[PDB]
């Protein structure tokens, strides 16, 4: 059972398992039920931009989500990630659709990791090549002709499908801590396009971190964002 | 048969297959016989520092090697790497020993890759963890307790062994070009410690680039620097 | 460049690169141009059955192809496979379509390997599971709902597409020889269904053997049966 | 957390976690505490021979262990393995040493798997090649010059070391059941040589079956036989 730290743009309120009454960004520490959430002023059809940061000195995983010239949405959570995640991990983006759907388009994805014990891993994508050998595409994750990472299924038309799960891991494992390490930090940006024919888009996109061999958990569809085998 | 672009710190003169009469840095385009070389003022026992750069606009692979406060050694070569290397590659460091030996210690290794079509892959190591999951260690390559990448065999004493070959690839494939790409560049630094009981150290260390599935070619020992199956 | 030993059911005559004037079974030793061929009495729409055998004592790779109660077609070739193939290999089935097409259905596939130095590897498939984890499916190779290995593309209708290449490797590398080995033999059976709307079906199906890391060579489509990067 | 079905030749009594008072063979269904055990008349220095069988109709995992012309030791357990193990698995041999040690030599290892829904996977080893590419060697598992699989560490002298863990998985995943399958069976033989300077040899050898991605669990040393992260 994978260890998971995710920042969720939870498109779909699932009150029956923790979610607030509304679209929200959440910080998930080994549970789909977010340790912290903020009301996310969704804007379907516009391009969102998530920034994620954290160092091991401040011990505060923080995420902001924004649209151009629009009021942003921040959510923080005091956590020491080296007590949660293994020493080595892989970073990725996941997204699902349930009975309700939405395009989970990733227009770009950067991520910087620093381990001053000064080791480092930076990577950024503004274009997603047809064959991304530096990405372990899991489930329904693919890349379209516009150089966009489609995390979840989308017809040739552009319409999103439902009951789809897909994630993109960066091929190289990251080293986010070492007993010796004085400070391990990481940042993570990505822009996304969420479009939906439904007035209740679902289910969400997330940037997560996990055991290197992390794979899509069975039953992880929909409100589970392809991160957990259950809702505990 | 792998495609190979390497920058060699050729410790050992092998005149009988191209090498100059002396220790030298070479730029190898799909051949152990360097398209360009410069006389390398070796300093066994001191820590060297190779810087490598190249963009696709200038089309000039250049490398400099230096010791602290000592006269450096530069070597350049006009080449268009996208006509040589495949679209996707893996970057690494190799080193061998023949009948003559030497420690092939890598104290650090950074590498930045930029694909403005602005995609990117940066990674740097000042410490090499006991288990580097973000490095495909090939052959005799291992990491010692001092956090140093030993490319080639070295007894517990510290003495180097001979007839050893070892390389370190970064786990993630790099994208160094795209038909669309306007400019693909990359830099690569690394510091090394070459020590030898022999007054004729051998055989050398190299930073190379290759087809992603690049592996140590049979017969690639010694003067082949674990890069080629032959000397053509 | 992979080492390849294949037994080809060459559906399509390609005279301009060696092929006989007619559909034929060929034995290919590191070349699409068969060292031996026999006239293959094709029967599109009926289920064929290839048996392949060889031991290192007799040094005779032999293949027979048959349809129920129909005159079979045998082809032999005296070769010592341990002088051709590496010590370790992977066994598989490949098939392509060019401008002309055909279904490349594999209804079953067994293979026995014996290394008396008595080591062994047997595997047989009468059903191909939706997710064959014990098969490295390459290119357009997939498995349909009838439990059939579709080597090459086929519409939902059942019509075959063209310019498609796909192979199925057995996940485990086989050990087909050892310097010590007294006798290494192997057999290989498989039944196939070739159907075509075209009166000139193309291009063929093959059981091949190759370096373990064998992958579909670029330009290997059509008359190359997804085995060679060229016709030499 | 891996799913594990093992047949243990538990060299070392660990009463404080279930073990009988004596060396024994056990059948472990997702727990180091055997669902069934029989008193194992150990014979250190002689070559043992374990036979394992099971089909899904009888639903009885059975194992026998024997030495030449010596009273054997049988242990059975009524279990339906398709309710325990995933649909796809990898089969292997594991062994550890704790504060007490012993050579865990595997002189041979066969295994037949049949899935009549008649699919099959057979493999046998009487010799273990220096580089067994068809074996995922985990931990301290290696192969010596006599063609023997040393599961656990052994000095050049031949003396076994302690606190060592090593397993050998067959490279190809096995298909041990399918919803459709009418009967899935498997057999598994292997001969072993257990030698110890200690009058209380430890800890044991096992043939196990697990989720394909099974790896040595942390803390699985000694009485855990490199199968479980704990003793529950
Ligand atoms: O796409 C959003 C969701 O759809 C499903 O839950 C549903 C939310 N509204 C519903 C209305 C009816 C039924 Br039945 C279901 Cl399962 C749901 C589920 O598939 C969820 O996993 C998911 O959160
Ligand atoms: O370590 C350096 C070299 O040693 C060998 O070549 C030798 C250079 N000096 C020699 C002197 C005698 C003999 Br025999 C040999 Cl092979 C050599 C070879 O093993 C080379 O590959 C290598 O370049
Ligand atoms: O499907 C069979 C074949 O089709 C092609 O060659 C053709 C055989 N008949 C033709 C007629 C016209 C043209 Br243009 C072509 Cl390329 C061909 C090629 O694509 C071949 O690789 C292949 O053997
Ligand atoms: O090799 C056998 C065993 O050695 C250890 O347990 C010991 C059995 N006898 C002992 C006596 C003292 C101490 Br401290 C220990 Cl840990 C043990 C442990 O390391 C066990 O995992 C193992 O079963
Ligand atoms: Ca939700
Ligand atoms: Ca040289
Ligand atoms: Ca042909
Ligand atoms: Ca025990
Ligand atoms: Mn939520
Ligand atoms: Mn040189
Ligand atoms: Mn032919
Ligand atoms: Mn026990």
3-state secondary structure of D58: coil
Helix (H) or strand (E) holding C78, with range, is strand C73-78
Which atom belonging to ligand 4 lies closest to the Cα atom of D14?
23
Smallest CA separation from ligand 2 atom 18, residue:
B98
CA distance C93 to C85: 16
Chain C residues close to D175, C-beta within 8 Å: 129, 133-134
> What string of DSSP letters covers C172-192?
SPEE---SS-SEEEEEEEEEE
Q: Is the CB of A143 under 6 A from ligand 1?
A: no
Taking alpha carbons only, the member of C119, C137, C120 closest to residue C128 is C137
Q: Tell the burial category of D22 from Cβ atoms under 10 Å away from its Cβ (0-12, 13-18, 19+).
A: middle
Q: Under 8 Å CB-to-CB from B42, ≥6 apart: which residues?
A: B11, B23, B194, B201
Joined together, the tokens standing for residue B132 give: 């580097």
Contact between B120 and A124 using a beta-carbon 8 Å cutoff: yes
Q: Under 8 Å CB-to-CB from C81, ≥6 apart: which residues?
A: C5, C54, C56, C59, C61, C176, C177, C184, C209
φ/ψ of C144, rounded to 5, equals -90, 180
Taking alpha carbons only, the member of A154, D121, D71 closest to residue C113 is D121
Q: Tell the burial category of B20 from Cβ atoms under 10 Å away from its Cβ (0-12, 13-18, 19+).
A: middle
Mutation pick for ligand 1 pocket among A100, A205, A218, A224 (CB with most ligand atoms within 8 Å): A100
**D111 to chain C, minimum CA–CA distance in Å?**
10
3-state secondary structure of C122: strand
Mutation pick for ligand 3 pocket among C33, C95, C100, C224 (CB with most ligand atoms within 8 Å): C100
Smallest CA separation from ligand 1 atom 15, residue:
A99
CATH of B1-232, one of 3.30.160.110, 2.60.120.200, 3.40.50.300, 3.40.640.10: 2.60.120.200
Contact between D119 and C133 using a beta-carbon 8 Å cutoff: no
Smallest CA separation from ligand 3 atom 2, residue:
C98
In angstroms, how far is CA A157 from the centroid of its own chain?
Answer: 25
**What's the DSSP call for residue C63?**
E
**What's the DSSP call for residue D93?**
E
**What's the DSSP call for residue D218?**
T
Chain B residues close to A134, C-beta within 8 Å: 88, 121, 172-175
> What string of DSSP letters covers chain B?
---EEEEEEE-S--GGGT--SS-EEEEEESSSS-SEEEE----TTSEEEEEEEEETTTTEEEEEEE-TTS--EEEEEE--GGGTS-SEEEEEEEEEE-SS----EEEEEEEEEEEE--EEEEEEESS--SS-TTEEEEET-EE-TTS-EE-S-B-TTSPBPSSEEEEEEESSPEE---SS-SEEEEEEEEEEE---SSSS--SEEEEEEEETT--PPTT--GGGTTT-SS--
- Ligand 1 centroid to A51 CA: how many Å? 29
Task: Find out whether C76 and C202 touch, Cβ atoms under 8 Å.
Answer: no
**A118 to chain B, minimum CA–CA distance in Å?**
6
Q: In this complex, how many residue pairs, one in chain C and one in chain D, have their CB atoms less than 8 Å apart?
A: 73
**B14 to chain A, minimum CA–CA distance in Å?**
36
Task: Find out whether D113 and D188 touch, Cβ atoms under 8 Å.
Answer: no
Task: List the helix and strand counts (H, then E) for chain D.
Answer: 0, 16
Which atom belonging to ligand 4 lies closest to the Cα atom of D96?
1
Q: Is the CB of C98 under 6 A from ligand 3?
A: yes
Contact between B125 and A119 using a beta-carbon 8 Å cutoff: yes
> Which residue reads 């061998």 in tokens?
B96
**D187 to chain C, minimum CA–CA distance in Å?**
14
3-state secondary structure of D205: strand
Joined together, the tokens standing for residue C106 give: 């594999």
Domain parsing of chain C, residue ranges = 1-232
Rounded to the nearest 5 degrees, what angle is found at the Cα of B23, between the Cα atoms of B18 and B25? 75
Q: Under 8 Å CB-to-CB from B24, ≥6 apart: which residues?
A: B10, B13, B34, B37, B38, B39, B40
Joined together, the tokens standing for residue D225 give: 């036989």
Residues in chain C, overall count:
232
Residues in chain B, overall count:
232
Smallest CA separation from ligand 3 atom 3, residue:
C98
Chain B residues close to A118, C-beta within 8 Å: 124, 126
- The experimental technique used to determine this model is X-ray
Which of D124, D174, D175 minimises the CB distance to C120? D124
């Amino acid at each position: 059972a994978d260890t998971i730290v995710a920042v969720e743009l939870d498109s779909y309120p699932n009150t029956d398992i923790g979610d607030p009454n509304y679209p929200h960004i959440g910080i998930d520490i080994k549970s789909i039920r977010s340790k912290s959430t903020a009301r996310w002023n969704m804007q379907t059809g516009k391009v969102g931009t998530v920034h994620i940061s954290y160092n091991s000195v401040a011990k505060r995983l923080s995420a902001v989500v924004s649209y151009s010239g629009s009021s942003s949405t921040t959510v923080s959570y005091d956590v020491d990630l080296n007590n949660v995640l293994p020493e080595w991990v892989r970073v990725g983006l996941s997204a699902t659709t349930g009975l309700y759907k939405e395009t989970n388009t990733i227009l770009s994805w950067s991520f910087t990791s620093k381990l001053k014990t000064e080791n480092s891993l930076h990577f950024s994508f503004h274009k997603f090549s047809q064959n991304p050998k530096d990405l372990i595409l899991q489930g329904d994750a693919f890349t379209d002709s516009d150089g966009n990472l489609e995390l979840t299924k989308v017809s040739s038309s552009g319409d999103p499908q439902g009951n789809s799960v897909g994630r993109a891991l960066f091929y190289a494992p990251v080293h986010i801590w070492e007993k010796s390490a004085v400070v391990a930090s990481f940042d993570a940006t990505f822009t996304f396009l969420i479009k939906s024919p439904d007035r209740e888009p679902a289910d969400g996109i997330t940037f997560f971190i996990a055991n290197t061999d992390t794979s899509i958990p069975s039953g992880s569809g929909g409100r589970l964002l392809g991160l957990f085998p259950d809702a505990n």
